[PDB]
Amino acid sequence: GHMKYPVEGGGNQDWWPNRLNLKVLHQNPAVADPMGAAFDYAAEVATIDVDALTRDIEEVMTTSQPWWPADYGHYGPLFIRMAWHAAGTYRIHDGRGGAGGGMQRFAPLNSWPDNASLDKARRLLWPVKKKYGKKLSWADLIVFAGNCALESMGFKTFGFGFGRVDQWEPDEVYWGKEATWLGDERYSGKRDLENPLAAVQMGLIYVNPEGPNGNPDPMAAAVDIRETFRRMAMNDVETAALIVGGHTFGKTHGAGPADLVGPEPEAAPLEQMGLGWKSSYGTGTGKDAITSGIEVVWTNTPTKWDNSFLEILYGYEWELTKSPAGAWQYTAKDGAGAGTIPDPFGGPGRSPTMLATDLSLRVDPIYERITRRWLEHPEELADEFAKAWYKLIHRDMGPVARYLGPLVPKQTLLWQDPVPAVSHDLVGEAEIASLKSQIRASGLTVSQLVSTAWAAASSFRGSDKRGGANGGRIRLQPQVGWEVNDPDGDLRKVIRTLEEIQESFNSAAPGNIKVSFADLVVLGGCAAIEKAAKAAGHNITVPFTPGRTDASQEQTDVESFAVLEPKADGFRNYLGKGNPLPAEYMLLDKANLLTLSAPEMTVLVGGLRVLGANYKRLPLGVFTEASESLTNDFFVNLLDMGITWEPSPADDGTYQGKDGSGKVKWTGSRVDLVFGSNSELRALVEVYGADDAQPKFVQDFVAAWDKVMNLDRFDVR
Amino acid sequence: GHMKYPVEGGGNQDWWPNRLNLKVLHQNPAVADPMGAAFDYAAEVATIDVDALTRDIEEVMTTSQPWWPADYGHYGPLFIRMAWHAAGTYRIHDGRGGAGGGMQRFAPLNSWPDNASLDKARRLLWPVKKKYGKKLSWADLIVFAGNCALESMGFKTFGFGFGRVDQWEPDEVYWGKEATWLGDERYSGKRDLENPLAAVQMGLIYVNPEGPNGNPDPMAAAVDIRETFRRMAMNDVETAALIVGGHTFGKTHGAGPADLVGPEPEAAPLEQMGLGWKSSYGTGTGKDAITSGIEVVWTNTPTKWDNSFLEILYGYEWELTKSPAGAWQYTAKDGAGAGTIPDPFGGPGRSPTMLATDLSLRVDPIYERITRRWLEHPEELADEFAKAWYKLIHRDMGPVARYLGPLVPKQTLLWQDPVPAVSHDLVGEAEIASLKSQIRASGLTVSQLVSTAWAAASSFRGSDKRGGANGGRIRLQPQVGWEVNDPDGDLRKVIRTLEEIQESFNSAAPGNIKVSFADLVVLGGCAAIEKAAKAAGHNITVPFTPGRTDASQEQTDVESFAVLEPKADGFRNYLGKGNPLPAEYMLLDKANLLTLSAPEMTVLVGGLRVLGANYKRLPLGVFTEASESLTNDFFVNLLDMGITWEPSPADDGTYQGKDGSGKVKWTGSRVDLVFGSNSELRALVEVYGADDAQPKFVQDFVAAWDKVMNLDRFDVR
Ligand code: HEM
Ligand code: HEM
Ligand code: NA
Ligand code: NA
DSSP states (O other): OBOOOGGGTOSGGGTSTTOOOGGGGSOSOGGGOOSOTTOOHHHHHTTOOHHHHHHHHHHHHTSOBTTBOOGGGOOHHHHHHHHHHHHTTOOTTTOOOSSTTOGGGSTTGGGOGGGTTHHHHHHHTHHHHHHHGGGSOHHHHHHHHHHHHHHHTTOOOSOOOBOOOOOSSOOOOOOOSBSSTTOOOOEETTTEEOTTOOSSSTTOSSSOTTSGGGOOOHHHHHHHHHHHHHTTTOOHHHHHHHHHHHHTSOOOOBOSOGGGBOOOGGGSOGGGTTOOOOBOSTTSSGGGOBSSSOOOOOOSOTTSOSSHHHHHHHHSOEEEEEOTTSOEEEEEGGGTTTTOBOOTTSOOOBOOEEOHHHHHHHHSHHHHHHHHHHHHOHHHHHHHHHHHHHHHHHTTSOSGGGOBSTTOOOOOOGGGOOOOOOOSBOOOHHHHHHHHHHHHTTTOOHHHHHHHHHHHHTTOBTTTTBOSSTBOGGGSTTGGGOTTTOSSSHHHHHHHHHHHHHHHHHHHOSTTBOOOHHHHHHHHHHHHHHHHHHHTTOOOOOOOOOOOOBOOGGGSOHHHHGGGSOSEEGGGTEEOTTOSSOHHHHHHHHHHHTTOOHHHHHHHHHHHHHTTOSGGGOOTTOOOSOSSOOOSHHHHHHTOTTOEEEEOTTOSSEEEEEOTTSOEEEEEEHHHHHHHHSHHHHHHHHHHTSTTOHHHHHHHHHHHHHHHHTTTOGGGO | OBOOOGGGTOSGGGTSTTOOOGGGGSOSOGGGOOSOTTOOHHHHHTTOOHHHHHHHHHHHHTSOOTTSOOGGGOOHHHHHHHHHHHHTTOOTTTOOOSSTTOGGGSTTGGGOGGGTTHHHHHHTTHHHHHHHGGGSOHHHHHHHHHHHHHHHTTOOOSOOOBOOOOOSSOOOOOOOSBSSTTOOOOEETTTEEOTTOOSSSTTOSSSOTTSGGGOOOHHHHHHHHHHHHHTTTOOHHHHHHHHHHHHTSOBOOBSSOGGGBOOOGGGSOGGGTTOOOOBOSTTSSGGGOBSSSOOOBOOSOTTSOSSHHHHHHHHSOEEEEEOTTSOEEEEESTTTTTTOBOOTTSOOOBOOEEOHHHHHHHHSHHHHHHHHHHHHOHHHHHHHHHHHHHHHHHTTSOSGGGOBSTTOOOOOOGGGOOOOOOOSBOOOHHHHHHHHHHHHTSSOOHHHHHHHHHHHHTTOBTTTTBOSSTBOGGGSTTGGGOTTTOSSSTHHHHHHHHHHHHHHHHTTOSTTBOOOHHHHHHHHHHHHHHHHHHHTTOOOOOOOOOOOOBOOGGGSOHHHHGGGSOSEEGGGTEEOSOOSSOHHHHHHHHHHHTTOOHHHHHHHHHHHHHHTOSGGGOOTTOOOSSSSOOOSHHHHHHTOTTOEEEEOTTOSSEEEEEOTTSOEEEEEEHHHHHHHHSHHHHHHHHHHTSTTOHHHHHHHHHHHHHHHHTTTOGGGO
C-alpha cells in the first residue's frame, strides 16, 4: 500500500482505518452549495408551470436522439425504469435511499450495475432541466418524468408532489460490505438478509432477474422478491402491482456479449462526458443495446397501458432459454406466439418472453392468487398500481406538508403517518408562559420532562423524514412501549399528568385557543430546561413553536413505526443489543439521523447528562454534583486530569474514573469517554469546558434542543 | 477487502480509488466550527493581559504534575521542543505545515513518532487554555508557551505575534507515500528528496537523529540537515543557530526498550483520554521516560541559556556509543567530564553526550566555521537564534498586518515579503471611476487586463498566506519572468501602459491622492470585466478596494519567491512539466491554495476562459463565439450533446469536440473536460448552464473574482 495526496483521497483514515469519521456530521456543506444562502427550492417550484413542464417532457419522450435511439420511438418506458430505480434504493431499516435527494446522479448509484443505461436516460432530460432551471430540481425531474411517462402511455396516476431539494454531494450510505460489484456476503442463517440492507447483491435494486444468485427458479426468487420489497415498505399486493405495472411497458436489453460493454460512468474516460458502459457491440446503442444482458419484451404493446402482461403470463407455458448474451430468461413453449411481439426498430416480430422473476408472479401461491384475480378483473390492477406507484415515488418525502403543486391529491394515507389539521386557534405568548408555569408546578421532575420531550422528538430521522414529536405518538403504540422510552413505567405518569394539564387548560381556555398533547410534551421539556438553567444561574427562555396535533392509534401504523425504534441512543446512554458497530459509532449515526453537527451533538450530550435524561437515570456520564441544573460540568470534569480512567473490572461496557485517593468518583460509557478521547471531539469539549464558557454552553444547548424539537415541523417551513 | 460504514470511513473512494476528491475544497467547514459565524478572534486577542498570561504559563512550567513529572522541575525545554515541532512541519514547496493552525493537536501530527510525549506537553497547558477561553487559541498558546519558556530560562526573544485562529478539523496534507511510520520511499539519485517533502522519513520533523537511515555519520547527516532546513526556509546560519539554541535546553529520553511503549494517541484506548505512548517500562514517566530512545543531556545547565552546548561540543572528543534503548549517540572520549552533566531527578551526574546530528555542527565544514565562531562569540549566536526562532514560529503568519498583540516589534524583515506603508490619500469613488475609464480607453484588451490581474492575485496561497497582488511584484523579478505569466508576451507592454496611466494620474490627481501600480493592476482587471459584461449586455460594477502598495526589487527576495511560481494553473489552462498528478488534480490543488470553493472554482474557470485569460491565448476551453464577452457560454457548450469529444490524435493533452458534420468545433484540455465528466462538477455546470442562469453566473463570477483580488488584503480586514 501507499498513501496518496488528499486531492486523490489520501487522509487520516489511511493510518487509522477504523477511526470514527465525523464527516457524517457535515454532509452537503453550504460552501459546496452553488445556490445563495437565501435560496428556497419550495418557493421556486411552487411557481412552475406544471402543464408546460409536462408537454416538454412529452416532447423529450418522443424525440429520439442519435446517441441513444428510442425503442419504439418512445423513451417513456426507459423513464419509468429510471424513476423506479431512483425510488427503489429506499430501505425501511434506516430510511436511507429513495429518490428524495436525486442521488441517482451521483456516485455510487449512478454507476451501480442495475443502473446501467440510466446515464443516458438522465442525459436525455437535460433539455428540460435547462429550460426550467432553479424552478425544477433533478430530484423532482427524475421521478416526474416517470410519472409523465405512465400518463402519456395511457395510465392515469394518483397524483404527484414536487419539493425534493437538489443536493451537491452524494449522501454516503452503507450499501453492503462487498468489495466486488454484484457480490454477495449478506446472508446468514436460513436466508436472513443482513440489516439494514434491502437488496440481495451489491449494486442491485432489489433482486436478481435470473433468480437467486443466477439460479432461475421462480419459486425461490419469489422469496427474495417478497423480502426485499418488504424492506422497501411494499406488501404482497403492492409488490405484484408494481412489477406487473412496470413490465407492462418497454423491454430489456441484451443484444450481444456483455464483455463488450466498457467501464461504468465513474470509471469512464473524460471524453465520454459522464456517460458510461460504452459498448463496442455493433452500434453499441438502440437495436444493439446491452443493459442487463437479458433480451425480453414482456408485452405486445410496450408503449401502451393494457392487460397484455398478465394475459401473456397466463396464456402461454414457459420454457427456460438464453438471451444473445447468455442470460437466463423464459420463452413460450412449442413455438407459441411466434412473431407476435413487436421489435423496437422495425425488425421482425419475436416470441413471448418473461424473466424468471416474472414467472414468480404465477408460480408463487400468494402472488398467483393476486395476479390471477387481476387477469380476470384488470381494473383492480390499475387501482393497486396507482396507489403503489404513488407510495413508491413519495415514500421518503416526509410530512405531507412538504408536497407541493397542483397535482397533490387531498386524500389522507395511513403510510404518510398523518397528523390532524389544526382545528382551533394556537396558544400565544401568554398561554405558553402560563402552561410552562403549570407544568413546572405539576410535580414532574426536570429529568422526567426532558426525557419525555427528547423521547418524542428524537424519533425523527432525516433520511426519510419520518418520526418526530408531531402527532403525539409517544403515548400510542408502539412508542409508548419502546424499551429506551419506558423501561420502568415512568412514562405513563408523565403522559397522564400532561393530559390532565391539557384538559384543564382547554376547558378554561380563552376564546377558541386549544392546546394539543403533542405540543405539551415538547413544551414540558422547554419548561424544565428553563427551570434547570435558572438553578444554574441563568435566566433563559427556551423557544417553542406550537402547532403539533394529536394522531390517534388508528392513524398510526404500528408495524411501520417498528423501524423507528432506537436500538441505540447515545444521547440517553442507551445501548441495546444488535447494533452493527460499537457505541461511539452508533452515537454519530444517531446524530446524523437527527441532522446534528458535531458541535450540536457535543452540547446535547453534555446537557442531557446533567439534566438527568439518561436511560433508567443511570449515573454514567453524569459528571456533576448538582441536580436538575444546566451547567457545563460534563465538559469540565471530562478534562480533569485529576481523574484516572480504567475499564470497569466487571467488563460491562463501563469505565471507572478514580481520584487521587483511589476512590471511584465517576463512571462512564464508551459514549461518554469518546468525547474525552477522540481528538476532534475533545477539541469541542475544551470549548465548552473553559472558564468562560457557561453562557455559550447554555445558549448553544438551547439552540440544539430547539432544533431537535422542530425537526419534523415542515408545517411551519 | 471489505467496504465499511461511512461512519467508519467507507465511501466512494473505495470503489474508485483515484477519483478526484472535492473535499479539499471544503476544509474546516462552518458547520463543524463551534464558534459563531460572528466569532472574531482578533477582537478577543486584543483583550488578553499578556503579562498575566506569561505568569500563568510560568506557573505551569514550574508545577510538576504526577502523570508526567518535570525534568529538572521545569517543563520549559519540553515546551520549546513542542513549539519547534509545531512550526517545524512547514515546507516551502506548497507552504503547508507550520504552527499557524494548531494542527499538532489533531491527526496525523498528534501521532507522528517525532511528536511522542508532546501529547503530555499540550495536556499540561489545558489549565491556561481553560483560564483564557476564547481569548486564546490553542494555536497561539502552543507556540507562545515555547517562547515563554525561552524567556523564563534566560533568553530574551525578538518578540511575538498572536493571531492564529483555531481550526476544528485536521488539514489533510500529503506527508509522503510511505504506509509505514518512519518509512523511506522518498529518495532517488544520490540524495534527491522528492518534492514537496521536507523530512527524510515519514513522521519525522526534519532528519533522523541517528544519521541518515540510522547510519550515525555526522557528515552525511549534515547533508540531510541542510536540505530539509532549506526546504523549511532556513539557511546555514539560521539552521546552526536553531539547533544550538534548542539543545541548549533539556534532554532526550530513552531509559528502556521502545517495545514497552504503547500505541500512538490516535490508536490508544478510550481511557487514556487522548494521550498515547503509554509505557510499561518502570513508572513509564519521568526518570523512566522514553520518547526518542536516545539518552542525551547536551549541557550542564538544561534549564538555563548559556554557551555550554558549543563549549562541550568543542571541548571534548566524541566516540560512538549506544543508548539504553539501543540508539546511536556520542559520548566524550577518555572518560572525560565525568559527573559534569546533572540528572533530571536528583540522580548522579553523568558524562557529556551528543547526537550524531549535533556533531554535524562540528564536522561539516560550513557549520564548523559558523559554530566555531560562536564558541568565542555567544553574543552573535544569541542574535542569530532570536531572529531564526522568530522566523520559525511566524513563518506561516502571512502579511505582518496579521500579527497581533503588544509584543510585535516594528522592524521590517525581508522574509516577510514587506510592502510599503500607504503614504498618500487613497483613490475614492470619483478617482476609481475615472481610472477605470482611462484603462478601458488605454487600448489594453480585456484579455490582457484580466490575464495580468489574475497573474498578480493568484500567486497567493492560503497555506502560508504568501503572495498575492499587494506589492505590485508582477513587474519585478522573479514574477515578471514566470513562464505562466510572460510566455511571449504582452506582460511588459501591459506593465508599461499601466505605469504610464499611474504617472499621468498621479501628476494631475486631486489633493494628496496617489494611486499605486499594484492597485492599477487589479483595477485594470476589474474595469475589463465591467467592459466584457457590457459587451454581453449587462451593466455591472466590479468591487475594488484600494490600498495596495509597490514593493521595490530590493524588498523582494527572489529566491524566496521561487516557490510561489505555478507549475500548473488550470484557471489559465497552463500545465508545466514536473507536476505530481494529472491536470485535473492540479486544478483542485490550485483552487485549494486560492481558498476557493467548488462553485467558486467552477465559475472562475468558465469566466476566465471566455474572457481570454488562457495562457498564450490558446483556444482550449474557449467555448464561445464572442470575443471578450462575459457570458455563461462555457457551461452551455460543455453540456451540448451535439458535440462528440475524442482525444486529439496528436496525443498532446487535448481533445477535439466535433459537431454532427464531423467538423472540429471546439478543443479542450483535461481541465476543461473534467467539468463535463466529473459527476459533482457537472452538477455545478448544470446550474450555470441553464437558461435562467446568466445573471447568477455573472454575479457569482464577480464575487469569486473579487475574492481572489483580495486574498492578501489583511491590511483592510
Ligand atoms: C422483481 C422485481 C424486478 C426485477 C427483477 C426487474 C428487472 C428488470 C430488468 C432486468 C430490466 C431490463 C433492464 C435493461 O436491460 O434495459 C427491467 C426493465 C424495466 N423495468 Fe423492471 N424489474 C423489477 C421491478 C420493476 C418495477 C417495480 C418497475 C416499475 C414500477 C419496473 C419497471 C421497468 C421497466 C418499465 C423496464 C423497461 C425499461 C426499458 O424499456 O428501457 N421494474 N427490469
Ligand atoms: C537537526 C535538527 C534536530 C534534531 C535531529 C533534533 C533531535 C532531537 C531529539 C531526538 C530529541 C529527543 C526527544 C526525546 O527523546 O525527548 C530532541 C529534543 C529537543 N529538541 Fe531537538 N532536534 C533538532 C532540532 C531542534 C531545534 C531546531 C530546536 C529548537 C530551536 C530543538 C529543541 C529541542 C529541545 C528543547 C529538546 C529537549 C526536550 C525535552 O527536554 O523534553 N531541537 N531533539
Ligand atoms: Na403494454
Ligand atoms: Na543550558
